[PDB]
Amino acid sequence: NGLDFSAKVIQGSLDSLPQEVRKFVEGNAQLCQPEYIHICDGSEEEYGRLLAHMQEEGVIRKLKKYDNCWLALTDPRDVARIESKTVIITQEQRDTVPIPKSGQSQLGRWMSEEDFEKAFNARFPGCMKGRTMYVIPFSMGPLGSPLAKIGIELTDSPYVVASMRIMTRMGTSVLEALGDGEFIKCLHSVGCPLPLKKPLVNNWACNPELTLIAHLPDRREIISFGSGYGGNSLLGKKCFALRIASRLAKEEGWLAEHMLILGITNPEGKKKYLAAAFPSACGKTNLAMMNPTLPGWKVECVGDDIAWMKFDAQGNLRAINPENGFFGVAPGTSVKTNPNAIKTIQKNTIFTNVAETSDGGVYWEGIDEPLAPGVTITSWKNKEWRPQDEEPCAHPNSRFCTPASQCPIIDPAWESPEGVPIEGIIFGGRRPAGVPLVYEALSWQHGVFVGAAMRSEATAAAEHKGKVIMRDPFAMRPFFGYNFGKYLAHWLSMAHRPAAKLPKIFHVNWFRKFLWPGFGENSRVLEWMFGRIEGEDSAKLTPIGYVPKEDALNLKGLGDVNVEELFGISKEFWEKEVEEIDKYLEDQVNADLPYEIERELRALKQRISQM
Numbered sequence: 001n002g003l004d005f006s007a008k009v010i011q012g013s014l015d016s017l018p019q020e021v022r023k024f025v026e027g028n029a030q031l032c033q034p035e036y037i038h039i040c041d042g043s044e045e046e047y048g049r050l051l052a053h054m055q056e057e058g059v060i061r062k063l064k065k066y067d068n069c070w071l072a073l074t075d076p077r078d079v080a081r082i083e084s085k086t087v088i089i090t091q092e093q094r095d096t097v098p099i100p101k102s103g104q105s106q107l108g109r110w111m112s113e114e115d116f117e118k119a120f121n122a123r124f125p126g127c128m129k130g131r132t133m134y135v136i137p138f139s140m141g142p143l144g145s146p147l148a149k150i151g152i153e154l155t156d157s158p159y160v161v162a163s164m165r166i167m168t169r170m171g172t173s174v175l176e177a178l179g180d181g182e183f184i185k186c187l188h189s190v191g192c193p194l195p196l197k198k199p200l201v202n203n204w205a206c207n208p209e210l211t212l213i214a215h216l217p218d219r220r221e222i223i224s225f226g227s228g229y230g231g232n233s234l235l236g237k238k239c240f241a242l243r244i245a246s247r248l249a250k251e252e253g254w255l256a257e258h259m260l261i262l263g264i265t266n267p268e269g270k271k272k273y274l275a276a277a278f279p280s281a282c283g284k285t286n287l288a289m290m291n292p293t294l295p296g297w298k299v300e301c302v303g304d305d306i307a308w309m310k311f312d313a314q315g316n317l318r319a320i321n322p323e324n325g326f327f328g329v330a331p332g333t334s335v336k337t338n339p340n341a342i343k344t345i346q347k348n349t350i351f352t353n354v355a356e357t358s359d360g361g362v363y364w365e366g367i368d369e370p371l372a373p374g375v376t377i378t379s380w381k382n383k384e385w386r387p388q389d390e391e392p393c394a395h396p397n398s399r400f401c402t403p404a405s406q407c408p409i410i411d412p413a414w415e416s417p418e419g420v421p422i423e424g425i426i427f428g429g430r431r432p433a434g435v436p437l438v439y440e441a442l443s444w445q446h447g448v449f450v451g452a453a454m455r456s457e458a459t460a461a462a463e464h465k466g467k468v469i470m471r472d473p474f475a476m477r478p479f480f481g482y483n484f485g486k487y488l489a490h491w492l493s494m495a496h497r498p499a500a501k502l503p504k505i506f507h508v509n510w511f512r513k514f515l516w517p518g519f520g521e522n523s524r525v526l527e528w529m530f531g532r533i534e535g536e537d538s539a540k541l542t543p544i545g546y547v548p549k550e551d552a553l554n555l556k557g558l559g560d561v562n563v564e565e566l567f568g569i570s571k572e573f574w575e576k577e578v579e580e581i582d583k584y585l586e587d588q589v590n591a592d593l594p595y596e597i598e599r600e601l602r603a604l605k606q607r608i609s610q611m
């Protein structure tokens with residue numbers, strides 16, 4: 001009877017699969033030994049029954065206050081991305097990360113093919129025993145689009161299948177769009193075959209000790225073991241659309257970036273599109289769907305996390321959002337801070353590690369909504385919670401997984417397969433001191449240097465504690481698919497291609513100490529950027545780049561804001577900054593640092609010495 005798993009197919013048919021899709025499914029069905037195989041069709045009925053099954057299994061809880069919303073609570077050991085267990089396999093180490101002068105590289109983690117094979121054999125054989133292998137055909141980008149890249153995710157987590165339905169275009173239509181074309185091979189398992197050898201915490205299957213998120217770009221495979229958290233288990237998102245995609249992008253002449261895409265319209269009706277790279281949990285989602293406080297202005301959301309970008313024939317940098325939803329940080333989200341998000345997350349939305357009110361609603365730190373007297377709160381740890389306990393009701397990296405199409409200000413061209421023309425790129429992070437509210441790069445090369453110099457306080461999105469200022473060039477430290485030096489060269493090369501309308505490059509700091517209220521008020525910084533792209537004489541030259549002139553920023557309704565402190569450029573801070581950037585780039589980028597980046601470093605060092 002061959003290696004035929006037709007007898008265990010519980011939805012769909014192996015005969016209906018493309019030739020190479022069948023081999024991929026059956027080959028891993030042989031390795032992983034699932035009891036059932038569920039080929040996903042992506043239908044509403046499948047989604048409802050999947051949620052009902054998880055509810056019956058005690059995996060998720062229904063939120064009775066809302067329209068088809070659900071709550072998952074995880075094992076506390078499996079709450080975020082884990083960079084130290086995140087690896088890229090290549091033949092040569094140099095292709096994946098530059099060879100550092102000292103210790104280990106901070107720009108990724110390389111693992112040899114031999115090392116990974118042994119790790120792979122220690123984990124995956126029989127790992128799905130007693131479980132259903134779900135087969136997820138998903139499209140990153142819109143269905144039909146020649147830009148879109150299709151993947152097949154195999155997983156034993158129904159939480160992953162439900163989340164992938166939101167975060168990607170998922171179903172039978174993807175298999176029909178694929179045919180005998182190429183697809184990314186995504187393999188995932190929580191790593192707890194039945195019968196369970198280890199006790200199960202919060203009904204959340206996971207394997208912390210053996211957690212491993214591997215990328216094999218040469219083989220076009222993503223292999224992920226042990227973790228159910230979205231960043232580690234939704235393999236279309238970070239693993240494919242940043243790590244695997246950024247390498248493909250380098251090879252084919254496009255860009256895959258950790259960037260929101262937004263459209264901003266002035267009072268007249270003139271529209272511009274901006275992209276912005278901030279590190280995980282440093283303000284992308286809130287900016288991408290902001291409610292602008294300036295009257296007449298209008299922000300619209302194309303995407304909040306991943307941008308795929310390429311020059312068209314006319315020289316416009318065209319961006320698309322390859323995702324289908326927002327996997328956004330929960331705490332802080334309110335009608336004050338992010339009202340467009342709240343209109344999105346009230347239906348067809350899955351929440352993870354947030355608190356639950358007794359009347360079937362969600363709760364977290366900074367929700368800015370006092371409860372009725374008598375309404376009690378169950379925490380993310382499934383305990384009865386009160387502020388007398390010093391612990392927060394929701395985990396810091398708790399999430400909502402919501403459809404993008406439900407955003408009130410979703411851009412009418414967000415599914416356009418030609419993309420939206422980018423006229424501005426914004427870099428930034430959490431710098432509590434020294435860095436101005438906004439500056440503008442002097443050229444493309446300086447702009448690329450500014451991206452490379454980026455630093456930001458650590459967040460709960462990965463394993464890093466203490467709120468320490470880490471290096472995060474382009475907000476891509478955890479996501480480089482290949483050598484960062486080559487990545488810099490790829491970016492710099494975009495200046496050389498004829499007729500290229502290069503976006504203006506800016507750097508922002510919302511988080512200086514906060515000296516700036518942020519959220520909707522950042523529309524004032526976006527106004528200045530809008531004008532500078534138009535070419536208004538609203539900029540003053542400083543050593544670090546152009547800053548807004550006196551009376552350039554609309555601060556009407558904000559006379560209290562200290563402009564001197566917020567835009568202060570200290571020689572003492574900045575001569576220290578360039579020294580720290582020098583040592584980092586030499587240590588970590590080393591022989592693969594392009595000359596032009598070193599020239600901008602020497603030029604910035606020079607300008608600071610003249611202060």
Ligand SMILES: Nc1nc2c(ncn2[C@@H]2O[C@H](COP(=O)(O)OP(=O)(O)O)[C@@H](O)[C@H]2O)c(=O)[nH]1
Nearest residue numbers: 280281282283284285286329331332510518519
């Ligand atoms: N102070 C301040 N906080 C912000 C701002 N934008 C977002 N945040 C907060 O920082 C966290 C991350 O924001 P988010 O937009 O979700 O970051 P993302 O993960 O990069 O999309 C949330 O808890 C927000 O409340 C801002 O402009 N100022």
Ligand SMILES: [Mn+2]
Nearest residue numbers: 258279280305
């Ligand atoms: Mn992100």
Ligand SMILES: [Mn+2]
Nearest residue numbers: 284285328329
């Ligand atoms: Mn986000």
Ligand SMILES: [Mn+2]
Nearest residue numbers: 492495496596
């Ligand atoms: Mn050049």
Ligand code: NA
Nearest residue numbers: 059073202203
């Ligand atoms: Na659970």
